[PDB]
């Protein structure tokens, strides 16, 4: 499969949770004509957290989807994820830098995409438990793929959430306020999170417009650092809700509203969302 001496580091891409993410070239032949990919790593190996990797890699080894980063292979010493390397990096970092080049019609095709890869995921009865645009990738101008399942699950098998509680921290300013309170993690919680998905693609990553930014706002800079859960859940209950952004049509914004439903039930699924999406595309255009 994949040896280790054949394998040469070129850089960085980035963490996430307990990995980092590194592009090397593989090149066997040692002539430097081997191919560019992405390397997955334990940022600091434990046995829980490896058990929790080698899941990990069993889920995208599962997946075979347009809109789904490809899963090439292992590597032992020790144990390394090969996936294909996708040039255009993160959708966060590619959406900041190029804004550019990025109207509305183009952040609804994304938005379109990562709906049919979340469908392929509930699918098979997965929860990604971590949709951010920094876990999106860019293969190209004209396509995403979900990038990164280091939290994702299987929901237990005669239940519908799958209830999870890691150490350390989560990223609460996405979490649906089932999965903060309770730590219930379904379907309707990634809704939750696609929502939050969209609205960053509709701020186009401005720093000051963030979730985090937003939210720490309205709860007060001046709350604390440990209650912040706490006031975040009560601002939630009182259906406290991210801004439209800037330029957001109502319709695109009511997308969003609708998957922030405190009322897990009421949340579209990921086929409608991919229904309305594609179709206010069709709108938007002719
Ligand atoms: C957006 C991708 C998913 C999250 N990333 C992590 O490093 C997470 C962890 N740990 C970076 C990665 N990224 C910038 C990539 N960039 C280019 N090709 C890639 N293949 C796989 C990931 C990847």
Redesign the pocket.
Same mark, same amino acid.
Not at 134 to 138: A, D, K, S
């Given at each position: 499969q994949f040896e280790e001496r054949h394998l040469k580091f070129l850089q960085? @891409?980035? !963490?996430? =949770?307990?990995?980092?993410?590194e #592009?090397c070239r593989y090149d066997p032949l040692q002539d430097n004509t081997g191919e560019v990919?992405?390397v !997955?790593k334990l940022?600091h190996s434990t046995e829980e957290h490896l058990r929790d990797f080698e899941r990990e890699i069993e889920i995208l080894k599962s997946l075979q989807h347009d809109n789904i980063? !490809?899963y090439k292979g292992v590597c032992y010493s020790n144990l390394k994820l090969i #996936?294909? %390397? @996708?040039? %255009?990096?993160?959708? &966060?970092?590619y959406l900041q830098k190029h804004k550019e080049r990025i109207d509305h019609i183009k952040l609804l095709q994304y938005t379109s995409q990562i709906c049919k890869g979340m469908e392929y995921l509930g699918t098979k009865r997965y929860i990604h438990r971590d949709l951010a645009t &920094? =876990?999106?990738?860019?293969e190209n101008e004209n396509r995403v793929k979900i990038?990164?399942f280091?939290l994702t699950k299987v929901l237990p098998q005669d239940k519908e959430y799958y209830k999870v509680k890691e150490p350390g921290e989560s990223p609460i300013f996405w979490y649906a306020p089932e999965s903060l309170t309770e730590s219930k993690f379904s379907v309707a919680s990634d809704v939750w999170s696609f929502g939050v998905v969209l609205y960053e693609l509709f701020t186009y990553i401005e720093k000051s417009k963030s979730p985090p930014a937003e939210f720490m706002r309205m709860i007060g800079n001046d709350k604390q650092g440990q209650m912040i859960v706490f006031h975040l859940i009560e601002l939630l209950k009182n259906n406290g809700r991210l801004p439209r952004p800037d330029g957001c049509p109502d319709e695109i914004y009511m997308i969003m509203t609708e998957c922030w439903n405190n009322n897990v039930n009421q949340r579209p699924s990921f086929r409608d969302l991919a229904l309305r999406v594609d179709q206010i595309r069709d709108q938007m255009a002719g």
């Open positions: 960085q @891409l980035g !963490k996430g =949770n307990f990995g980092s993410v #592009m990919v992405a !997955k940022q980063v !490809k #996936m294909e %390397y @996708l040039p %255009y990096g993160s959708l &966060r970092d &920094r =876990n999106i990738l860019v990038g990164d280091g």
